[PDB]
């Protein structure tokens, strides 16, 4: 049925929240309490989503590192009574989004899939960021694709179409994998299969995750290894 | 000194001549003698180089699969008194360029390099072809880049520049690796370091390879593992 799996990376494969919480506390030290920094990180992810939503509607693209940097500067101003950061620290903090750690199932899940399928990233992050995340999150791909290559963010149909034509594969032979329904719904409109990965801690222990019923998408799993099993991939030794 | 190594793939890392000789003999069987098919393969590689040279001068890009297909059709006509192929076999034969095998040093050499450096392909082959070659040649990369992404073939400066800006790395911190001097000279003009890999069998046992003296490029090696040693990469177990 499928020749390749195409992955949403941030959140789907990476625990960005834990990464940015620990990264920020490492840089800022005793000047901020953990509970306060956690709140900023949650608003930071929200600002990122709000900006990409706005740029998608305007059919525009800009550097996602810049999106993260600009939203951090705005949030630092909002939190300025509580703590401060230097310009140098703004850059170091923004780097956290290029140091994401993976969920524990992900490296072995990707390896298991590759016995039968090509695996590729299709991320909204800049190309340089996802290459760096491959090292921090221990991701090995057949190909790395970024919104930067297409001048458009997911869910714009040109991202999925361009991924298909670059890979030389029909959309019906691509399985889109994500912990976000918006991405799967958009891939399905281009012709791709859909696999939803539940990430109940993506927004934290007291966080808010989507509710996806069985049957909405082609697969509904709790880990990448489970998806590999359901696709008939033999287990690793 | 360097953050990433950027690789010429066909020839530099892959024995395309042996691949296409055995691939063609597998498809065509007893209808062609090995010595005759070898001659076609050598002319086929030459036709590919002649066409890319022509397209570079015209500042044009087209599918490299189409370049290989069109040149094969021309050569089949030239050799038509000796043997024939069907349209279906033209496609199967053209597929050989996406099934290239690596030189024996290459998979472990790339793995050794990755302890210290990002490694990426920068190939003139289409994106889909180099993804397929990663499986046949056992190549694992941090990123895959193709002339198709830039609408221009190497040696056009926009390929090296675009690779640098996509990776987020200064050209002076990129080491270009190739068994072809034209590619290294062009990368050097953009600011990259240069590593020449001798491949004395690239054009066959009685084949013609360049003569490169010590000092022309930053490194001059006989294998990727040797390059890794010279870059201070610890050996594999």
Numbering used by the authors:
A (entry chain A), B (entry chain A): 11 to 247
What did the article's authors report about this structure?
Studies have shown that both RhCESH[L] and KlCESH[L] adopt a two-step catalytic reaction mechanism by 18O-labeling studies.
However, sulfate ions, from the crystallizing solutions, were observed in the catalytic pockets of RhCESH[L] after the co-crystallization with CES. The residues involved in sulfate ion binding, including D18N, Q20, T133, N134, K164, and Y192 from the core domain, as well as R55 and R59 from the cap domain, formed a polar substrate binding pocket that was well-suited for binding small, highly hydrophilic molecules. However, the binding of non-catalytic ligands, including sulfate ions and products L-TA, did not cause significant structural changes.
